[PDB]
Amino acid sequence: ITIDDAPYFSALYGPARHGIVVPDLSLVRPHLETLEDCPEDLYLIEGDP
Amino acid sequence: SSKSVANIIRKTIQREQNRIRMLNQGLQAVSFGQVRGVRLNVNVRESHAILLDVLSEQQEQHQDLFNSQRLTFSEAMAKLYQRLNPQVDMGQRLPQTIGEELLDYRNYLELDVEVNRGSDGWLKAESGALSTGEAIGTGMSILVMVVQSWEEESRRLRGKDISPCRLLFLDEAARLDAKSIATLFELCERLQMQLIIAAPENISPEKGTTYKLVRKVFKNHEHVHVVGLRGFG
Amino acid sequence: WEEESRRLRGKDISPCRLLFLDEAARLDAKSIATLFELCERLQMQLIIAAPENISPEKGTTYKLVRKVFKNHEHVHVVGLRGFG
Amino acid sequence: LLDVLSEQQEQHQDLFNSQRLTFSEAMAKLYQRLNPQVDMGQRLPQTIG
Amino acid sequence: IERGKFRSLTLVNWNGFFARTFDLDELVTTLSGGNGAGKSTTMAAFVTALIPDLTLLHFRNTTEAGATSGSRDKGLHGKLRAGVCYSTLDVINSRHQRVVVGVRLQQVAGRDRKVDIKPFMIQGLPTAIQPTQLLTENVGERQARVLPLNELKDRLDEMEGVQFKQFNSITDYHAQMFDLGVIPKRLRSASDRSKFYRLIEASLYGGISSAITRSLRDYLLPENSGVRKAFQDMEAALRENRITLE
Amino acid sequence: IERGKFRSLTLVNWNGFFARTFDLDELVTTLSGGNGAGKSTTMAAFVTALIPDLTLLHFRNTTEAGATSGSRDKGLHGKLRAGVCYSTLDVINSRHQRVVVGVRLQQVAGRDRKVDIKPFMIQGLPTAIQPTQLLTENVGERQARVLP
Amino acid sequence: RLIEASLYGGISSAITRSLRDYLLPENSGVRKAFQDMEAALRENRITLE
Amino acid sequence: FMPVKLAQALANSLFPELDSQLRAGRHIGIDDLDNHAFLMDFQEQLEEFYARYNVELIRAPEGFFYLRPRSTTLIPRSVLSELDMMVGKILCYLYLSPERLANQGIFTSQELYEELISLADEGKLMKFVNQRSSGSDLDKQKLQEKVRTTLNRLRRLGMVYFLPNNNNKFTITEAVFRFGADVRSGDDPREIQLRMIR
Amino acid sequence: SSTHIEQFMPVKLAQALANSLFPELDSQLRAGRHIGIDDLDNHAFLMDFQEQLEEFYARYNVELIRAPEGFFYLRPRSTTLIPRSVLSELDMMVGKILCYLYLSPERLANQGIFTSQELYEELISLADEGKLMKFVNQRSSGSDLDKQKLQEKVRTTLNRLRRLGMVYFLPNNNNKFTITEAVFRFGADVRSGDDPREIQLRMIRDGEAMPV
Amino acid sequence: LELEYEEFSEINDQLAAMIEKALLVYQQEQRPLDLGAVLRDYLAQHPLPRHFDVARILVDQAVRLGVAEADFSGLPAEWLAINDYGAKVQAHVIDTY
Ligand SMILES: Nc1ncnc2c1ncn2[C@@H]1O[C@H](COP(=O)(O)OP(=O)(O)OP(=O)(O)O)[C@@H](O)[C@H]1O
Ligand SMILES: Nc1ncnc2c1ncn2[C@@H]1O[C@H](COP(=O)(O)OP(=O)(O)OP(=O)(O)O)[C@@H](O)[C@H]1O
Ligand SMILES: [Mg+2]
Ligand SMILES: [Mg+2]
């Protein structure tokens, strides 16, 4: 993304800027209990990567 | 480490292949004498394909060479590459440089230019194996490839509402026949790209602007008389 | 060169003279007129090539068209004449 | 140089009082004798003599 | 949307052209005239204004199109005339800003055939003023007077809102041109200038360029930093330690 | 004295030409046609028949003219088809003698794209014989064959 | 060289560079007299070396 | 004078060794990183330099460099033996597709010995060793010795690289294609290679 | 300034390498040919640029050497980039005999033209005929057949020395030949009047001559 | 088979003849010539598809007659319209014969 839209997008996505896109979010539900090694606040988003 | 590096390399390679494939389609069905199409053929070198696969899946067989802290990562890459294909020699150059070479994705790709000539299939474009007009047309094709690639490259450093100008030349344009010139006009028009062509009057393209030149001697000095026409069609 | 060999040659033979020029289209009408008068004054034969018929009122001319035909290629040749 | 070599001592010593011609110059061309700056090779070019 | 366009090309005091302006077409412009009329001269003007680098500029004849450097003459000197000469381009961006870019040319006196070149740029000019008018004085004589850079700077600074920038290095000139969208890539270094000139001159003479063909990957593929900088940072601790030990 | 002249040029089994004969002019002969028609090929056939020295022959594109390249391929092989090929000239001597010079060309089987040349000359041929017919045999219903 | 230069047209670099070799013919009468002097000059070179 | 880039090229420290190898007939492949890069960089001038010797510097379409002498070569020429071309064409055949899975690029002397014995005709084998020979053990031992000898000759040409140990196991380089057949549109390499070997 | 020959090479060396005589001479010198006074073109060229050629060939670890008699040749070092070879003992017998012929004033009347028969007669005159015969054939006892074999081997070696430049055949007669000064290298073991063994050791240390 | 033949048309040469005869008067009287007016008047005598060729040929004939002294003034000329459908011409008036 260009420098002109960069500040807009960074404000829009806020803390979730560095989340992960995952199109279902139910396939993670079994994996999730294992996450003991991760940032204290993990963000997940659904959509076509 | 290991797999993730292989994945980023693979994705970069895949994206480059796809972009090339998109550029490639704009050049289908271009008529230049007996040439009927042009392509940029992209392939992956074997000696690097096997290395990429090994780094992806056999890492437990070489982890000693990767986690040894007496040598750095790029050095590890160079040493692994020499372990495969042992016949390769190294020109007394530091393993660090060979490592950084392995880190650069472009080194994994092999590039060719091909043309669909006449009754034959796809052939590598050799100048000596083409007529004059076919050579000129193929040159123009590759040049527009370069320009499109460069514009895609730089747009991430340019304003969102800026579109650079595009312009190319052709000297002694009389060397091309009417059909070839029609093809070239179609290409540039579809690419929003300007042209300036010089011909000793032999060709009179109806579209565009034309300038008539005549050199004279006036008050014992050389002088060029200029006239212009445009708007026809 | 022809003058040099005057001694060796038999008295009664004058050697043939012939030259070429590809992409003649690079020359304008005045230049070609000059070239023709030069070569004819010297009894010099010429063979020239151009995509378009640049010399309509002098010498002979042939027109070549290539046809793809049954998975091979064939060239068709037809002559051209100054007036009709 | 042809004049220098052609005209010999006994008769032309009366001619040699000109500033441009002398005998020693034939040996002076020994310097030029060793190697002229010829470029393209066919048949056999060699030296000033 | 709305790609930019080159609008016109102006020559002042070149061989055969005292003051001439060509209005370029949006798609195709065709130069036409007998042999020796001056067509290639106009294209020489265009490219020299575009890339004012005397190390690269070499206008060899169309015949012998592919030979070596050969002579020490670059073929440019003879196209100028005694005194001061100019070559300028007029451009319209996607923003519809009118920018004029060009160079000032002069024959350096001496035994050899050498040239002196100085780039410059003007912004904010009214649409009502043409380049030929800026660069000439309509003195009483039959023929006008071409005015040097000093007079030009004084004349332009008098205008309201018009800015005149005069460059000391080619790098700055190319940087400004890229920022305004006149060229597709910002010529970081001399190597970039060389490749850009290769592109232009290969287009000019025509044919499958040998140099483009040799280095195809260098031209068609962008260089990616992501794969590298991670490992330069991770490698840093070892690099410093090794250097300290040495 | 009456200077000699080139009467005609004949090509057999070249790339695009099966058996074609161009009749030259006393002063100027012009070849026209779109790109790739075969004009430069005709030039090349003539010069090959004139100087068969294979060390010299090197047919570069018109672009890249004057560049000493040492190209891997001299560009002659591709202008020939499989089988036997010819290129011949008919000349009228100052003595009003008809002489036919020429060469037999043939591709060499093998990875290297090499070519074979064998010159020849004919004297005293009757004026009524055309080279096109002399070099071919009429086999079948107007389906002639070339002969070694 | 002559025919090839004609075919591609223009000022042939090789022709002009060696124009002496192409235009000026050789003379046998000059050689016949120079044979004697050639012997003499070769002898002189021997002694000098 | 001399072209500046040519003087630069031959001033390079790598030139004397490369010159010595090239004049011996060695082929430079993509394996020799530095030499191959050097040739890629200075080809335009090295071709002219070696033309002065009536010897041609060729870059094969596969990528490897080598010298080809003319009839008027200024470097003394030498010629390979019949058995040498036989073995070379065998190696070209072994540069196959199943090779990758069969040996992972590393062969042994026995592979070549047995392939040669199996694929060639007996008459030309006798012509190679000696016409008086007939299917005897000593003849086969002599043929093995000759195979090792010619294989070492080929290693000097750069065709085949021995793995660095005393045992006779090696890998085949791309430059072996010089022995290969002519390729026509759609033709299968195995078939054409076998057709010539027959 | 940049792009200037002097940056990479001395002007005189480039001037030498650009000469038309260089390729022939380089090819011959690497082949082992000795250069004497008679072939003026090559000898004068060598004299003109001697130091440049010596510095050039030094890159290969070989010395371009000039004998006091005025003839040049190449002597490789132990780390030579160019292979090195040694002559056969029969070659030495014929070489020393050719030297003794060159010196001999009694045969100066021949004006330099010698015949293979005369050379053979001198050789048999000085060496031990029958014991030298041992090298031609292990069973030789003076038989004329074996004598002819010795003569033919001598003829062959003489031809090989012709290739080394040690002797010139006449333009039309191959049975007669003329000597050159290069033959004096066969005398290197005796040109100084001192203990032979120390001479031999100095030669082997200098790389002139190996044992067998 | 036997060689066939094809012939050229001389329509453009005839066109050049009419134009040169029509234009000769300007030189003889040394009358100032304006390309705009002349082209507008002369294109009316032919149909639209042929206009382009007529314009080209007329310009070829006109430029041989003298020069335009205004060219040295540093003042560019305007683009004059010469017919409907939008054709334009740029040229200074010819004054010096
Ligand atoms: N460097 C130079 N020195 C001297 N005269 C030159 C120089 N360059 C060009 N000229 C002359 O300027 C005139 C115009 O040359 P130019 O190359 O522009 O012609 P042109 O119209 O492009 O011709 P053509 O299309 O036939 O090549 C010619 O007389 C040419 O001789
Ligand atoms: N060596 C070759 N190998 C393969 N095809 C070739 C070879 N040489 C020429 N051709 C093809 O033969 C056809 C005739 O080419 P040629 O150059 O003779 O045509 P031309 O009419 O002279 O064209 P132009 O005027 O554009 O030079 C073209 O399709 C060219 O691609
Ligand atoms: Mg031009
Ligand atoms: Mg052609």
Author numbering:
A (entry chain B): 693 to 741
B (entry chain A): 1236 to 1468
C (entry chain B): 1385 to 1468
D (entry chain B): 1286 to 1334
E (entry chain A): 2 to 247
F (entry chain B): 2 to 149
G (entry chain B): 199 to 247
H (entry chain F): 9 to 206
Give verbatim lines from the article.
MukBEF folds the chromosome of Escherichia coli and related bacteria. The SMC protein MukB dimerizes at its ‘‘hinge’’ domain, which connects via the long coiled-coil ‘‘arm’’ to the ABC-type ATPase ‘‘head’’ domain. The heads are bridged by the kleisin MukF, whereby the C-terminal winged-helix domain (cWHD) of MukF binds the ‘‘cap’’ surface of one MukB, and the N-terminal middle domain (MD) binds the coiled-coil ‘‘neck’’ of the other MukB. MukF also recruits the dimeric KITE protein MukE.
The resolved state was free of DNA, and the neck gate had opened widely. ATP binding and head engagement had triggered the detachment of the MukF MD from the MukB neck, which resulted in a swing-out of the MD of about 180°. Detachment of the MD was facilitated by the mechanical distortion of the MukB neck constrained between engaged heads and aligned arms, while the MD swing-out was stabilized by the binding of MukE to the top surface of the heads. This surface is formed by the engagement of the heads upon ATP binding and is a highly conserved DNA-binding site in all SMC complexes. Our structure reveals that occupation of the top of the heads by MukE and DNA is mutually exclusive, suggesting that MukE senses the DNA-free state of the heads to open the neck gate. While gate opening is a prerequisite for loading, it is likely detrimental to loop extrusion and needs to be suppressed during the operation of the motor. Our findings suggest how this is achieved, and how the switch from ‘‘loading mode’’ to ‘‘loop extrusion mode’’ may be implemented: once DNA is inserted into the clamp during extrusion, the top surface of the heads becomes inaccessible to MukE, blocking the gate opening mechanism described above.
